[PDB]
Nucleic acid binder design. Structure first.
Ligand SMILES: [Mg+2]
Length: 94
DNA sequence: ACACAAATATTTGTGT
DNA sequence: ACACAAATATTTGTGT
């Protein structure tokens, strides 16, 4: 149906915070979004590219090696970018 | 969006 | 059958 009101940055931040170890792979981010938001079960090419692009562009998502590919985590300075927990409004940079 | 490299995964080929 | 190497395919990550 309609696309949810959350930005790609909010979606990634939801997935990272939802992981028990606060670290998650890229496919884990795909699965999180598709499980909770049916709009993203279609045309995966497009938005999954936008997910990868948002992971590399924004400093707030830092890549970390494992112990498949790599774990994505939140910079602690940006862990609560969405202060009220609704993920509708994002705090701006210090 | 695009192109593209780098890193992994899968399929195919060869020898025994 | 197996082990293993080559070659391809796919995913992951980065740069305008
Ligand atoms: Mg980044």
């Amino acid at each position: 149906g309609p696309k949810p009101p959350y930005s790609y940055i909010a979606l990634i931040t939801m997935a990272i915070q939802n992981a028990p170890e606060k670290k998650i792979t890229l496919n884990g981010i795909y699965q999180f979004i598709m499980d909770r938001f049916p709009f993203y079960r279609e045309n995966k090419q497009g938005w999954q590219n936008s997910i990868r692009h948002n992971l590399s562009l924004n400093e707030c998502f830092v890549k970390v090696p494992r112990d498949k590919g790599s774990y994505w985590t939140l910079d602690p300075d940006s862990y609560n970018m969405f202060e009220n927990g609704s993920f509708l409004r994002r705090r701006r940079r210090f």
